[model samples]
Target chain A: MSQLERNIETIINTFHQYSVKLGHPDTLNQGEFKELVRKDLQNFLKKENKNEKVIEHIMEDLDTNADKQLSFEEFIMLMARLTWASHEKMHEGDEGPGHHHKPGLGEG
Target chain B: MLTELEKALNSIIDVYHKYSLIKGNFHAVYRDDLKKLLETESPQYIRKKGADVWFKELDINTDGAVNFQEFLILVIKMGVAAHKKSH
Candidate 1:
């Protein structure tokens, strides 16, 4: 297989494994998927804004259409969007960015 | 002190690095894939301009920056909603 194929295969395989463990047949479900994101955010925001309240606030926003369940389109769109954010953060690296200026999220 | 909701959010975060471990793809591609999976069944495009739109929507407070918490909330919320939609 080509490199891209191989890499995609690995991703598929990992997802398959995780999906099974999490008990979904075709795709990942919201509960498990959110757990994965929570871990990522925890790592990213290790300093400030580490509270569950922040998470809740964001989740509320994501349910933008006001549906209790976020449709597939919304879910994937959110993920794709995050890639942009991640890239920004990745390039920005661990140095001081202008936003880190918030009061408490920095000190503790 | 996390609720079940918080635990679920954490799992979503862990999956990003797990997906990143997918070999042979550009970091951007992997990131795109990760984001897509989090948001919906299909991944969204992330051209530079697209990224700007995402940031605008995610900014929430109209601040110039996207914080980790904001990032996680947007991600997991969509992820959860997507999950429900599919199943």
Candidate 2:
């Protein structure tokens, strides 16, 4: 398989890794979702002052049907938005308040 | 710090900008830019089915230019194909 292909699987599996922790096997409850962001997106989330509020807002936004759990498809949208934000940050000229995460650098 | 999955996501975005920025548009991808993107990102896939056809499918809005969202669909397509192959 290609590198990109493997990465795609990695992304999908990463979602499952957390989603299966509690409740539904195919969706992530609020706790699981928060943990996913806390562990996987520390740099991005660090920008917000109130982590809990921001996380609440994020859950409200992504939970289209308001079931209080995030399906894999819904989680992909979050990643897509984060990807877009990071892409813009990458091309920006200024160093900004704090350093943005670099591609291929965060492997945890 | 970011996770491996975060890094993977960023790589996809990086590749899009790498091509999208070539013409300084940064917002959308023209045909030539997309062609170059596919040729570099997935040469084997392009060789097997050709880039033009893939680009045509991606231009879903028929807007001639591919926006960031549309470009993501392309990646999703590739990702899905890989999943099927592995299964």
Candidate 3:
């Protein structure tokens, strides 16, 4: 597929990589979801001092039904917003977060 | 550092802005630019259908342009089509 199509698949692959580790293979519980943000989506998120709190709030939006789980459809919602946020950031003359997990990035 | 997934998302955002910025709107992928975007960004899918049909279909709010949110709708549509092919 094209680059865009391949990138879309990367998002899908990232979700499954986390979602299958816990509970149902089709969904992500709170723990799995939190780890996803902390790991795969770290750059898109702000370095809030209340990082855990921010994560909880996001989960509330993602899991408004109170199921505490996220299916692929629900998960895509996060990607949508991140895409939006990063686009806005770019217009401000700043690029989005880092591209890959390279050592010496200084985040550690 | 960003992970592979975050990089993928960042790239998608770049693709949108690359075309949208043509008109200085930044957030909008206008009609002509939308066609340009598809032809350059994903010629494989645009071959069967005309790009004219997409700008209207993706302009879900009828805002005269495809905003970032609206663009995601296109991404979602393409994602589903891609998934279908693999199945």
TM-score of chain A of 2: 0.80
How does each model score on TM-score?
0.32, 0.48, 0.47
Tens digits of per-residue lDDT, candidate 3, A19-75, equal: 899789978888888888888766667473137988876775555234678777656
Off by over 4 Å in 2: A94-108, B1-87
State the lDDT of candidate 1 residue by residue for B1-87, as single tens digits.
999999976876665435433432111122344345345432443332354556566555442334344566556655685677675
**Interface RMSD, all models, one decimal each?**
12.4, 11.8, 12.1
Runs in model 1 deviating more than 4 A are A1-34, A45-49, A93-108, B1-87
lDDT of 1 by residue, A1-108 (tens): 899789657545544543454554434445544554565345444432356566544444444343333333334445545555555655454465444423222131
After superposing all C-alphas onto the true structure, candidate 1 shows an RMSD in angstroms of 18.3
Angstrom error at residue B16, model 2: 27
TM-score of chain A of 1: 0.45
Q: Rank the candidates by TM-score, best first.
A: 2, 3, 1
- The collision pairs in model 3 are none
Task: Give the worst 10-residue stretch by lDDT in candidate 1 chain A.
Answer: A99-108
**Docking quality class, candidate 3:** incorrect
DockQ of each: 0.03, 0.03, 0.03
- lDDT at position A94, candidate 3: 37
